[PDB]
Design a protein around this ligand. Structure first.
Ligand code: NI
Length: 525
């Protein structure tokens, strides 16, 4: 570069897009409004003498039926039209086989990066570790890293020949290789690892904060993150704002001289970090998280309910809407295709599910345990929102039963944590949404205490390990359920309730409802 010259560099970022190429049902986000916003930024940045780099923290895949059924094709193409420069590979990039991910890499006109994922049989990288960019006459390297929780938490049959090495250790190596060979002026990491306040990752793999603290000071200008699905806007040193409000000031984290940023999920925001580079040094001069037509739900004095924009409305780019519409249309048609059949009614009438054990509870929970490899499972009966009629089943029928996009989760727990949890959960009452549906659970409750507690037909052993499935809602205290998210053994899978029930029905069909029919395994009084 030229000594004593100030370069202007604007870094844009998103992450955890999870199939949200289309806006949602209240008119928020979507890539069309993203495109309008980012196109306008590029012109402004250029008018002021600067350059743009646009990066993703990954997890493009998995979260919306119309995207998932088309292997995220609309998403990746849309990202081309927005103009992404690079992306980190996310754990949900491994939800589908490598055949599909390699096809995504060819759909994408930008690299999908990860330095830390190796083939076990050869010791070679499966992906490109970094990409180099020219902006002005600066050389900018972007390294990609992926959480090493991927393979403890994803389909084991996919990871026979795939190893996830510690990312922080990989970053130290790549930074040293880069600094000894290509010699970039600036290095940024796009990662998929997560932001934990003060590096308190608990039982998750270490994330961005721990990494930045482990690296040499200032060796990265910044980390563009993901996976935890947070707006990184600090309330105070080492503490994110809880309930960040769109359109407000957002101070990103800085740890050991390294900025750490994240833009939540689902294209809700485009993050914008403006930097000035002079004589080797990067200075952050402005940061903002820019809402993409995010709205707040309000009920005013008169019971008129609306969603109100936090910031001025961004118009949908028409060229992105032409690109995306045929996928949206094909996805909506794919929802009506038969995915299974049942030989009797699956019962999800509001009363039945809030009062007694139904065959819909058993079907949903089998689906959740099949997905997480769990031993047993519970949810709120008021999570079940409809029945499926005896006969053919479409994804659309399943979306009626599970329409609100909750996330399936699991927890590993001692037989004794099992006993303490099911105990307080069996205190929940009928005529109420909190009423527990259970699977692979048998007991007789009397006096708020459990007698003949059986997971899958065997008594519980207090020093045994058991895997429970449930929903994110129940796991974070919802329905006054005992919190599981601050426990060791907890894992948020990112898989959506309707997708999990649909997949389970597709592979189990045709269904024989008698295997799902409750035979009095749980009872009270
Ligand atoms: Ni993730």
């Amino acid at each position: 570069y030229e000594q004593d010259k100030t370069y202007k560099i604007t870094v844009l970022h998103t992450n955890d897009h999870h199939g949200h190429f289309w806006r949602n049902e209240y008119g928020e986000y979507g890539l069309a409004a993203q495109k309008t916003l980012v196109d306008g930024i590029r012109k402004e940045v250029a008018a002021e003498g600067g350059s743009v780099l646009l990066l993703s923290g990954g997890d493009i895949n998995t979260g919306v039926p119309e995207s998932d059924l088309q292997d995220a094709e609309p998403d990746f193409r849309g990202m081309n039209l927005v103009g992404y420069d690079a992306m980190a590979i996310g754990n949900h990039e491994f939800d589908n086989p490598l055949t599909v991910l390699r096809q995504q890499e060819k759909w994408a006109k930008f690299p999908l990066l990860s330095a830390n994922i190796y083939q076990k049989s050869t010791g070679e990288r499966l992906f490109k570790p970094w990409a180099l960019f020219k902006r002005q006459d600066l050389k900018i390297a972007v390294i990609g890293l992926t959480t090493d929780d991927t393979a403890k938490i994803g389909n084991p049959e996919y990871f026979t020949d795939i190893e996830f090495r510690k990312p922080a250790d990989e970053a130290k190596l790549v930074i040293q290789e880069l600094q000894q060979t290509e010699k970039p002026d600036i290095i940024i990491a796009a990662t998929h690892m997560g932001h934990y306040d003060n590096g308190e990752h608990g039982c998750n793999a270490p994330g961005d904060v721990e990494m930045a603290r482990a690296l040499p000071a200032g060796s990265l200008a910044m980390i563009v993150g993901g996976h935890s699905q947070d707006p990184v806007c600090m309330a105070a040193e080492n503490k994110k704002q809880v309930d960040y409000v769109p359109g407000t000031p957002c101070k990103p984290d800085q740890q050991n001289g390294i900025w750490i940023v994240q833009a939540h999920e689902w294209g809700k925001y485009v993050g914008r970090a403006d930097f000035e580079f002079r004589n080797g040094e990067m200075k952050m001069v402005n940061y903002q998280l820019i809402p993409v037509n995010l709205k707040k739900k309000v009920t005013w004095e008169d019971g008129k309910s609306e969603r109100v924009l936090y910031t001025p409305e961004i118009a949908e780019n028409q060229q992105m809407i032409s690109l995306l519409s045929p996928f949206q249309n094909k996805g909506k048609a794919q929802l009506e295709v038969k995915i299974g059949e049942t030989n009797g009614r699956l019962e999800g009438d509001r009363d039945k599910v809030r009062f007694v054990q139904t065959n819909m509870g058993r079907l949903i929970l089998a689906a959740q345990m099949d997905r997480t490899g769990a031993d047993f499972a519970v949810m709120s009966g008021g999570g079940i929102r409809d029945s499926i009629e005896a006969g053919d089943i479409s994804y659309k029928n399943v979306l009626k039963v599970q329409p609100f996009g909750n996330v399936v989760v699991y927890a590993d727990m001692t037989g004794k944590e099992v006993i303490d949890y099911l105990t307080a959960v069996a205190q929940m009452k009928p005529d109420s949404g909190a009423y527990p549906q259970f699977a692979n659970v048998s007991f007789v409750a009397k006096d708020g205490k459990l007698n003949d507690l059986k997971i899958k037909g065997e008594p519980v052993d207090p020093a045994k390990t058991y895997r429970m499935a449930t929903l994110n809602f129940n796991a974070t205290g919802g329905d006054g359920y005992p919190r599981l998210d601050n426990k060791c053994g907890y894992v948020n899978t990112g898989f959506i309730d309707a997708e999990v029930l649909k997949a389970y029905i597709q592979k189990s069909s045709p269904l024989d409802v008698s295997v799902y029919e409750p035979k009095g395994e749980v009872s009270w009084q």
